Amino acid sequence: NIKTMIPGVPQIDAESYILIDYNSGKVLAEQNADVRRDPASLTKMMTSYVIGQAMKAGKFKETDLVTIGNMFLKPGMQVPVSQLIRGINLQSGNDACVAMADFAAGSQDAFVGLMNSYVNALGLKNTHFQTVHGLDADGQYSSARDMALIGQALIRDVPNEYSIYKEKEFTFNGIRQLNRNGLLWDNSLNVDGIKTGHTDKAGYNLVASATEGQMRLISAVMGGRTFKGREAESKKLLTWGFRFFETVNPLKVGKEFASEPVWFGDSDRASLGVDKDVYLTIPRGRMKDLKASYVLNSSELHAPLQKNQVVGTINFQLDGKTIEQRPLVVLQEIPEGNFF
């Protein structure tokens, strides 16, 4: 029963936490992951997400200058966008958020409206932002799950913005500022994200992400007890996640997974696979025992068969139990067969 066991979770010294796989979205561990808490500076992930989308859209460059009104910024100061986004991500500067909010949306209210528009665009059911920096507000809240998903969106939708989160330091006005994510300096893990935060109502919060090979995990901890424990507890989850789980990529697009006969077509056989790449998070070491089969929606396949046409379902089995399902599609189209 060593292969088919469910691992016990470590005791995490925080009120809420969640651990997910970046590729497959699988939840490996959770505790009060949907309780609505104060997000503190984790809010700045969404602030960074709004900014990342605008630059990705081309609205402003990282070299553009922003004039201040009205990091210790002063009115009339001209600060490159590059420095303000680093003030947000590395330093957690609340003043840099305000500056970038007026610069990106014209006002803080217009910028909070965008933050909450992406909240709905991501489907978050337990998040609402009242601020651009994350200071405690009566009406703003988030949760460990929603914050783990915001971090996923950062990595997925704006990778150029996300690459900043791994920088250990930046210099503003001749003063070196360190990134507050102390896990970047950990020799045992490969941590390149994401964001720390803390307030009186929120406690000590950390959204972290690490990689081991091509596997990527995202942890979110909220309501942490101490400043140091913030990083220690997140390190507990990530190492635990990598020790007991492995992400595997069994089938990618274009790879033939099965062949079935085709009637009335230009060809006699169809090449069946998947249109979206498959990522499965399984107990580490059980990839050798992973079995895959499939069912068909029809007794026969009739031409014409369009490209990426659904014809059945793939079933991935581990220990005789289906763990994931994906649509089985036609890879190459097959037009109607003609007769001379």
DSSP 257-296: -EEEEEESBSSSEEEEE-SS---EEEETT-STT-EEEEEE
CA distance 148 to 21: 10
Assign domain 1-244 to its CATH superfamily. Answer: DD-peptidase/beta-lactamase superfamily (3.40.710.10)
Residue written as token pair 């933050």: 115
What gap in Å lies between CA 256 and CA 314, rounded to an integer?
Answer: 12
Strand duo 203-212 + 191-199: pairing = antiparallel
A 10 A CB-CB count for 199 gives 15
- Annotation: binding site: 195
Is the domain spanning 245-336 CATH 3.30.390.50? The answer is no
* Nearest CA-CA partner of 172 in 68, 277, 91: 91
Q: Which of 16, 26, 48, 92 is catalytic?
A: 92
Q: Which two tokens stand for residue 98?
A: 């305000």
For 239, the enclosing helix (H) or strand (E) is: helix 227-244
> What does DSSP assign to residue 246?
E
Structure tokens at 137: 């507000």
Helix axes 81-89, 94-105, angle to 10 degrees: 130
Separation CA 329–CA 315 (nearest Å): 13
Which residue numbers belong to the known binding site for substrate? 195
Per-residue DSSP letters for 51-77?
Answer: HHHHHHHTSS-TT-EEE-------TT-
| β-pairing verdict for 310-318 and 291-296 | antiparallel
Active site residue 41: yes
Q: Is 26 a catalytic residue?
A: no
Residue 3 annotated in active site: no
State which approach was used to obtain the coordinates: X-ray
Contact predicate 233/183, CB 8 Å = no
The structural domains of the chain, with segments of one domain joined by +, span: 1-244, 245-336
In 3D space, the residue among 238, 332, 314 whose CA is nearest the CA of residue 277 turns out to be 314
Whether 1-244 shares its CATH topology with 245-336 is answered no
Tell me which of 16, 41, 48, 142 is the catalytic residue.
41
Q: Which of the following is catalytic: 16, 26, 44, 271? A: 44
Q: Which amino acid is at 101?
A: A
**Separation CA 52–CA 44 (nearest Å):** 12
* End-to-end CA gap in the chain: 62
Q: What is the resolution of this structure in A?
A: 2.5
